[PDB]
């Protein structure tokens, strides 16, 4: 039951409870061993636990396909510290170390509990006998494919080697297959399900985007005669949500260009909101001062390009304003998501302009054509363009903002609770959109 899992969670990995109820359900679904499983959770212990913990209770060997030795090494080392009988198979292993491991796996009841392996070996003719004998002797408990997204040309990290993993699944019929990734759109999910030949019904555990404490809205720069004024009001409202502490928290303004960053910081400062520009144009000494001053709460507002380093995060960010629409929905989600980590209410505003859209739309097309000359045509290029369109749709359409973000990532409808402009006043947004339409000339 639940009992066996909970003990071995503390007994071996030393945790009281699973981080989330989702991480628990996933782990349990892998334990039952009746269904192929797909885990999409942000990088961390939670994800790895979903195959590692079950690997031990299995009473057989779990094979884990991972794309490169670096990632394999991190894990074998961490598993070894927990006194776990883990091994790796790759070319970088010595001829003698190799012969020893192969001998261990040919042995009735081997010591290897978890075997990490690269996609080339997992599919190479030289390894199939070993795989077959393990199968014959019912010693194969699970096949795990980490970095599952790598199978997809529509993903960011396409690896041809991952296309061979499909044929392997059927051979390991007896054993359930677990596919894990941090990052998959609906389209990348489909490629994983198909290319790895997962057996239906596939159980899906996918950490949702939604955060109840973030109020999202879009403002149309085309309808606003005082832009710098509108931003000042927005900044001051978001700060001083604790009237007796006065001005509490900090904020980020994101801009595409360095000129825009310098200019906006000045326009905010001159209206009584202390802001400093942060961009790649500044020297390292300047960048450290600006970051320190913002992290230490000396200057409450930082105006930055995409360049803003996340060396450490900040829990009290009360607002994230995008002066310019981002390259991609993933970019916007990640940048806007730097707000409200503490759990307290926060504001995410996108200042949208058809002029900004056209300019960014055009720049993406140019940087794609530049990479097409260097590395050739790819399906990933069209994912880059679709990634922007989801954000253009976010700005120019009526509907919950949290829903539009959920749709792009492949989450279910989230529980918005008047947590975006549309859900708090549909007609207001309709009126604003109608007005943008009249301005279209």
């Amino acid at each position, epitope marked *: 039951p639940e009992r066996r899992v909970r003990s071995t969670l503390k007994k071996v990995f030393g945790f009281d409870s699973f981080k989330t109820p989702l991480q628990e359900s996933a782990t349990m679904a892998v334990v039952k061993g009746n269904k192929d499983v797909f885990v999409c959770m942000p990088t961390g212990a939670g994800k790895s636990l979903c195959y590692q913990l079950p690997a031990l209770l299995a009473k057989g060997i779990t094979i884990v396909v991972s794309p490169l030795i670096a990632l394999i090494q991190d894990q074998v080392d961490h598993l070894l510290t927990l006194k776990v009988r883990v091994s790796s198979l790759n070319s970088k292993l010595s001829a003698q170390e190799r012969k020893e491991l192969l001998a261990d796996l040919e042995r009735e009841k081997p010591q290897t509990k978890i075997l990490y392996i690269t996609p080339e070996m997992a599919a190479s003719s030289s390894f199939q006998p070993t795989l077959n004998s393990l199968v014959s002797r019912h010693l194969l408990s699970y096949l795990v494919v980490d970095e599952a997204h790598c199978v997809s040309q529509w993903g960011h990290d396409f690896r041809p080697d991952y296309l061979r993993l499909g044929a392997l699944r059927s051979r390991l019929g007896h054993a359930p297959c677990v596919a894990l990734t941090a990052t998959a759109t609906p389209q990348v999910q489909e490629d994983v399900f198909a290319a790895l030949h997962l057996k239906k019904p596939v159980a899906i555990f996918k950490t*949702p985007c939604f955060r109840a404490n973030l109020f999202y809205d879009v403002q149309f720069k085309e309808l606003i005669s005082d832009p710098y004024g509108n931003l000042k009001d927005f900044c001051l409202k978001a700060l001083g949500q604790e009237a007796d502490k006065g001005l509490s928290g900090c904020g980020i303004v994101y801009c595409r260009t360095r000129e825009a960053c310098e200019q906006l910081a000045i326009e905010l400062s001159c209206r009584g909101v202390n802001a400093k520009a942060y961009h790649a144009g500044l020297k390292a000494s300047e960048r450290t001062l600006v970051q320190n001053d913002w992290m230490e709460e000396k200057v409450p507002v930082i105006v930055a390009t995409i360049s803003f380093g996340m060396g450490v995060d900040k829990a009290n960010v009360r607002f994230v304003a995008h002066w310019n629409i981002a390259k991609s929905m993933a970019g916007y989600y990640q940048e806007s998501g730097r707000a409200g980590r503490d759990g307290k209410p926060s504001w995410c505003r996108l200042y949208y302009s058809r002029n900004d859209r056209d300019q960014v739309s055009f720049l993406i097309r140019k940087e794609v054509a530049k990479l097409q000359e260097k590395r050739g045509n790819k399906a990933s290029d069209k994912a880059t363009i679709m990634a922007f369109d989801a954000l253009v749709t976010f700005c120019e359409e009526l509907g919950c903002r949290h829903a539009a973000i959920a749709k792009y990532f492949g*989450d*279910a409808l989230p529980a918005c609770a008047k947590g975006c402009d549309h859900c708090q006043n549909p007609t207001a947004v309709r009126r604003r959109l109608e007005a943008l339409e009249r301005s279209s000339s």
Partner: nanobody
Framework: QVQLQENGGGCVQAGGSLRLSCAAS????????MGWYRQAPGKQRELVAA???????NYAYSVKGRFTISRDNAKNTVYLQMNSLKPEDTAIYYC???????????????????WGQGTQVTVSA
């Protein structure tokens, strides 16, 4: 989970028309492909027609130019316009929701194929 409601079956004169429909209900994010299969009495189930989300269509040769599959992606509904029906079209018609992605706000979900119960089509000579 997913329920498939099929409709539009019946008895018609050869040369007549029907429209089969199949609405899928549940916590459905998407369906890769919606399709019509048919099984005539004591004969193997065959593909009549299928349409991806995308609108790529696929017809059995014996119905090309007579039958038209179409899909409302937002209502998870597929349609089969059947014209110039022939006796040989007599069968139980099944809908397939291939690659159905279901998901709750918790993040638990499924990817599965689902089938309807079947709807009788009979064509009298």
């Amino acid at each position: 989970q997913v329920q498939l409601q099929e409709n539009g079956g019946g008895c018609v004169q050869a040369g007549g028309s029907l429209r089969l429909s199949c609405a899928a209900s549940g916590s459905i994010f998407s369906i890769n492909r919606m399709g019509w299969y048919r099984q005539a009495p004591g004969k193997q189930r065959e593909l009549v027609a299928a349409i991806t989300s995308g609108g790529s269509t696929n017809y059995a040769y014996s119905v090309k130019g007579r039958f038209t599959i179409s899909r409302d992606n937002a209502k998870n509904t597929v349609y089969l316009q059947m014209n110039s029906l022939k006796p040989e079209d007599t069968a139980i018609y099944y809908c397939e929701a291939y690659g159905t992605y279901t998901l709750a706000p918790t993040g638990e979900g499924e990817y599965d194929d689902y089938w309807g119960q079947g709807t009788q089509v009979t064509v009298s000579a």
